[PDB]
Design a binder for this molecule. Sequence first.
Ligand SMILES: O=C(O)/C(O)=C/C(=O)C1(Cc2ccc(Cl)cc2)CCN(CC2CCCCC2)CC1
Ligand SMILES: [Mn+2]
Ligand SMILES: [Mn+2]
Length: 194
Amino acid sequence: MAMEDFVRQCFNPMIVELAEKAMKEYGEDPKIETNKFAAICTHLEVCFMYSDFHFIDERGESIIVENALLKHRFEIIEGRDRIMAWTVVNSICNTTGVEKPKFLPDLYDYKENRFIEIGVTRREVHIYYLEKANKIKEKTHIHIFSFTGEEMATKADYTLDEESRARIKTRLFTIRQEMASRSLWDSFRQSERG
Ligand SMILES: O=C(O)/C(O)=C/C(=O)C1(Cc2ccc(Cl)cc2)CCN(CC2CCCCC2)CC1
Ligand SMILES: [Mn+2]
Ligand SMILES: [Mn+2]
């Protein structure tokens, strides 16, 4: 199996289409930078999984419920074009009064009233965390996940319940096991760069 076919069989076609456009528009070919194609899809998938099933009930408390339900706990900013991402961020700042970040985050959490930056790493978790805290310098909460099961989050506050975190980590565990059984893991593990 080529990594390219792996990606197209592993991820939802919606994630794949978004990832393909992002690479071409930035001048990269998903048929050439295949590990980067798989990394883009993975990060996107985790941002969507992170918002999945989370709403805010009548008490303003966080509920899980698995479109038709309109009180979402997170606004998804990743995946949008920059015009619309900045439009959503401004409207959130306009209406909750949080500070406008200088870099685009991945999500807004309406319960804690903060932006969130998500990282998914195959290197030691401190690394992606540092790369991101360097640029945020910083009301933007950071949460990194790894393919080994470790996480690192600002002030050791993981935002989500244990079960949602275990679902993300299970998904990453499966993605690693299936790449490994096809001899793709080693190359993917080595390709991440700072
Ligand atoms: O690094 C992350 O984990 C992450 O979520 C990054 C981002 O959202 C991008 C912006 C960014 C840049 C710096 C920081 Cl600290 C935070 C966000 C980087 C390139 N992204 C687009 C990317 C798609 C593939 C081709 C190259 C550009 C979008 C904005
Ligand atoms: Mn992002
Ligand atoms: Mn991110």
